[PDB]
A paper describes a structure:
Mayaro virus (MAYV) is an emerging arbovirus of the Americas that may cause a debilitating arthritogenic disease. Mature, infective alphaviruses are icosahedral enveloped particles of ~70 nm in diameter composed of the structural proteins capsid (C), E1 and E2. The E1 and E2 proteins are transmembrane proteins that are organized in heterodimers. Spikes are involved in the attachment to cellular receptors, cell internalization and membrane fusion.
Here we describe the structure of mature and infective MAYV particles obtained by cryo-EM at 4.4 Å resolution, allowing the observation of N-glycosylation sites in MAYV E1–E2 spikes. The presence of the E3 protein was not observed, nor in the cryo-EM density map, even with a low-density threshold value, nor in SDS-PAGE gel carried out with the purified MAYV used for cryo-EM data collection. A total of 80 spikes, formed by trimers of E1–E2 heterodimers, protrude from the MAYV membrane. Similar to other alphaviruses, the MAYV asymmetric unit (ASU) is composed by four E1–E2-capsid units (T = 4) and maintained by eight main interaction interfaces. The high frequency of histidine residues forming the E1–E2 interface reflect the plasticity of E1–E2 pH-dependent interaction and their role in the spike assembly/disassembly process. MAYV has two predicted N-glycosylation sites: N141 in E1 and N262 in E2. N-Glycosylation at MAYV E2 N262 protrudes in a long, continuous and branched density in direction to a symmetric N-glycosylation at the neighbouring E2, which is reminiscent of a molecular handshake. The N262 handshake glycosylation site is located at the center of the MXRA8 interaction site and potentially participates in the interaction with the host MXRA8 receptor. The core region between E1 and E2 forms a cavity that is occupied by a long extra density, which cannot be explained by side-chain residues. The MAYV density map suggests the extra density could be occupied by a fatty acid that may enhance interactions between E1 and E2.
Author numbering:
A (entry chain C): 371 to 419
B (entry chain A), C (entry chain J): 107 to 258
Amino acid sequence: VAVSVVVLLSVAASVYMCVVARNKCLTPYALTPGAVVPVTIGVLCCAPK
Amino acid sequence: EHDCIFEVKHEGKVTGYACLVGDKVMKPAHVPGVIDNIDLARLSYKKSSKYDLECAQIPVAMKSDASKYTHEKPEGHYNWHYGAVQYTGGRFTVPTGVGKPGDSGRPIFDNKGRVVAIVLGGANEGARTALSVVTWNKDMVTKITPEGTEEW
Amino acid sequence: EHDCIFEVKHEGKVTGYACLVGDKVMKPAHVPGVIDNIDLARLSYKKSSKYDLECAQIPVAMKSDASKYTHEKPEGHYNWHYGAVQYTGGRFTVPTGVGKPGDSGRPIFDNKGRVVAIVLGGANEGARTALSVVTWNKDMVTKITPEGTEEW
């Protein structure tokens, strides 16, 4: 049970940190007037342009 | 309307402003409260931490008569709600203390009306005060707060 | 002025408005019932679902009946079949709320004679209306829409 809970929590912490890194990365593009959202669209939620 | 203010009113009284530019209702995240207008409240305002901005996308047909953003700044005299700002050498100043301690969302634009920056506040230094601003320009956003200029 | 814009008729009703420039017959792909002019309609046209465009190849006997064009978009305000158009910040608007469904196909001009935009659909907002056109850029041609449209 200990190795199962540590596998669960390690995966969860990795995913949490990865998504907050992505969220920090995307932020200065939603703020500015004038959308550019360059060639890195592969991880992007900014659809309409 | 031409004054973008759309007063951010809290507990009935007011606490600052917010502007509407291009496609975006931006609120300075330094200010607490909601705006006076009714239908501009059901939006998913995204929160930037290291520099205060609370942007959100405009909804459909929401009278998009906003100001025009030109990501460039020649030096000289620009327009401001209380007067005329002087821009020289990257420094950005006005008369000291004439600005109130609560004009907290007032933008700046040229003679024509091309808005570029937004404001955060001032301090007391001399006859010319340093205007701490976050600003949208150079196809991104950034913050220039000097030393010693506490927020309005 | 008058530069031979060609309607699509069916059953007595005309909405589809093809245009033809240079070598290519550019038609919006709505409202089928291909054009009255059978000497110009017997041509197998190529259809593109991404750009909603029809790309028939003109007959050589129509060598003279077209316009000139451009692959750059200068800045300012222009004319069209109804009124004025204002193109600034990289996007179009139409003069003050006059458009109706079925006008998809008129071209947009410059102050000296060329032709840039072909209009498919548009977005109602209030004072200054928005519209989606296909336009040129140095043989790499795309589509651009505003958000909040109904196809015309």
